[PDB]
C-alpha cells in the first residue's frame, strides 16, 4: 500500500511545485503589466491635457 502512498505523494508534490512555479511567473508577469498599465494611463492623461491646450 506504500510504494502506492509514496508514489501518489511524490506525484502530488511534483504537481504542487509545478503549479507554485507557474504562479510566481504569473503573479510576477503581473506587477509588471499592472505597473505598465498605470505608467501608460499617466502618459495618456498628460497627452490628453496637452492636446486640449494646443487645440
Amino acid at each position: 500500500d506504500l510504494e502506492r502512498a509514496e508514489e501518489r505523494a511524490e506525484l502530488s508534490e511534483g504537481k504542487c511545485a509545478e503549479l507554485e512555479e507557474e504562479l510566481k511567473t504569473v503573479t510576477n508577469n503581473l506587477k509588471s503589466l499592472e505597473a505598465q498599465a498605470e505608467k501608460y494611463s499617466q502618459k495618456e492623461d498628460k497627452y490628453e491635457e496637452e492636446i486640449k491646450v494646443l487645440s
Binding site: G14, A17, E18, E21, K24, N28
Partner: protein, 372 residues
C-alpha cells in the same frame, strides 16, 4: 545599527553587478559589468571630458567607446577596471562613502588564493572600508535556501558551476566548471533566429534578442517529442513585437536555445552538459554524502531561470542516479539573486560579526588574514 544598517553586499559577476545593503530583500543596484573607454575626443552637451564610463552609461554610449569586461568567467582579470566598477558601485550607485561601511563581497568557486588577497588589498588599502569578508558564491546561494549541505548548479552570464557543499565547506575536488552560460545562449538564439529567416541588423535589433531569450524561452521536458510537436504545428508558436511594429515569430527555437545547456553539441562544444555534470560532481564526492547532495540540488543564477529547467533536471538525474535514491531539485523564484540574498542574510546576521576581517586584523596580519 552601527553596522546592522551599514553592511554592504556586492556580488561581482561576469555580466551584472548586484549590490545593496545587508538587510534588504533584493539588490538595490544591478548593472552591467563593463568599463567603456572613449574611442574619440569630444563631449556630451553640458558635460566635461570623461575618461571612462561604467555600467549602463557604457552600454548606452557603446558606439563611441571600447567596452571591456573585468571579470572573465567569474574570475577578475583586470584589476584597474575592477576598481573602477567598485568605485562606481559605492559612490554613484549606492551613493555611500565606503570608509564607514563593512563590505561583504563574493568570489567564484576555485578563485585563486592570490586574488582573494588582492581584492582585500584594494578594499582595505584603496577604499579604506572598516571591515570586509569574501563569501563563495554557491555557498551563499545554498544558505539563502535555508540549508548547509547540498550541491548548487550555479549559472550566470559567463560560467556554470557545480559546487557540492557539506556543512558549509565547499568541496574543492568535486567542483565542476562549464564555460557556457547565458551570454553563449543569447548568441546561439541569435543565429537560430536569423536562421529562421531574420535580421538583427542594427544595435537595437541585437540587444533585444536577449530580451526574447529571457521572456519567451523554455526548457522543455521531452525535448524529443517537442520538436515532433513543433512540426504538427500547434499553437506552440510565439510572436514578439520589436522596438517598432515588426512582429517577429518564434515558435520552435524558443526551446532549442536552453536544450543547448543539456546538449553543448548544439554549439560545437564537446564538454558534457549540466545534468551529467551535476551527476559527475556527485560521483566524485564521498559515498556517505551522496544521498544528501541528491536530495538538495539547489539552483541559482540568471540562466537557470528558463521555465521547466527544474523538471528536465529532475528527470535527467533520476534516470542516472541509483533508484534507491531520492532526487530533489530546488529552484526558488528569486534565484537570479540567490547569491546576493544569501549574503544579505548572512551579513545582517547576529553571529557574523565575529567573522568580519577588520582593518585591525589586516594592518596587523597582511592580506593573508582574510585569505583563510
Amino acid at each position: 545599527d552601527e553596522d546592522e544598517t551599514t553592511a554592504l553586499v556586492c556580488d561581482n559577476g561576469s555580466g551584472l553587478v548586484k549590490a545593496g545593503f545587508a538587510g534588504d530583500d533584493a539588490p538595490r543596484a544591478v548593472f552591467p559589468s563593463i568599463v567603456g573607454r572613449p574611442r574619440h575626443q569630444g563631449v556630451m552637451v553640458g558635460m566635461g571630458q570623461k575618461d571612462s564610463y561604467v555600467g549602463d552609461e557604457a552600454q548606452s554610449k557603446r558606439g563611441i567607446l571600447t567596452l571591456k569586461y573585468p571579470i572573465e568567467h567569474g574570475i577578475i582579470t583586470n584589476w584597474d577596471d575592477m576598481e573602477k566598477i567598485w568605485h562606481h558601485t559605492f559612490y554613484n550607485e549606492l551613493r555611500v562613502a565606503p570608509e564607514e561601511h563593512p563590505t561583504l563581497l563574493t568570489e567564484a568557486p576555485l578563485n585563486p588564493k592570490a586574488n582573494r588577497e588582492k581584492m582585500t588589498q584594494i578594499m582595505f588599502e584603496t577604499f579604506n572600508v572598516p571591515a570586509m569578508y569574501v563569501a563563495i558564491q554557491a555557498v551563499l546561494s545554498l544558505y539563502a535556501s535555508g540549508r548547509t549541505t547540498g550541491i548548487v548548479l550555479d549559472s550566470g552570464d559567463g560560467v556554470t558551476h557545480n559546487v557540492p557543499i557539506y556543512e558549509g565547506y565547499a568541496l574543492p575536488h568535486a567542483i565542476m566548471r562549464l564555460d557556457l552560460a547565458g551570454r553563449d545562449l543569447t548568441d546561439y538564439l541569435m543565429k537560430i533566429l536569423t536562421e529562421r529567416g531574420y535580421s538583427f541588423v542594427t544595435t537595437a535589433e541585437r540587444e533585444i534578442v536577449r530580451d526574447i531569450k529571457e521572456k519567451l524561452c523554455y526548457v522543455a521536458l521531452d525535448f524529443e517529442n517537442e520538436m515532433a510537436t513543433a512540426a504538427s504545428s500547434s499553437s506552440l508558436e510565439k510572436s514578439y513585437e520589436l522596438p517598432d511594429g515588426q512582429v517577429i515569430t518564434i515558435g520552435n527555437e524558443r526551446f532549442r536555445c536552453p536544450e543547448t545547456l543539456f546538449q553543448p553539441s548544439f554549439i560545437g562544444m564537446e564538454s558534457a552538459g549540466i545534468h551529467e555534470t551535476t551527476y559527475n560532481s556527485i560521483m566524485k564526492c564521498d559515498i556517505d554524502i551522496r544521498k544528501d547532495l541528491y536530495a538538495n540540488n539547489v539552483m541559482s543564477g540568471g540562466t537557470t531561470m528558463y521555465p521547466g529547467i527544474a523538471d528536465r533536471m529532475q528527470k535527467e538525474i533520476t534516470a542516472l542516479a541509483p533508484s534507491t535514491m531520492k532526487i530533489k531539485i530546488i529552484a526558488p523564484p528569486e534565484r537570479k539573486y540567490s547569491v546576493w540574498i544569501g549574503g544579505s542574510i548572512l551579513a545582517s546576521l547576529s553571529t557574523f560579526q565575529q567573522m568580519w576581517i577588520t582593518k585591525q586584523e589586516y594592518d596587523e596580519a597582511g592580506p593573508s588574514i582574510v585569505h583563510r
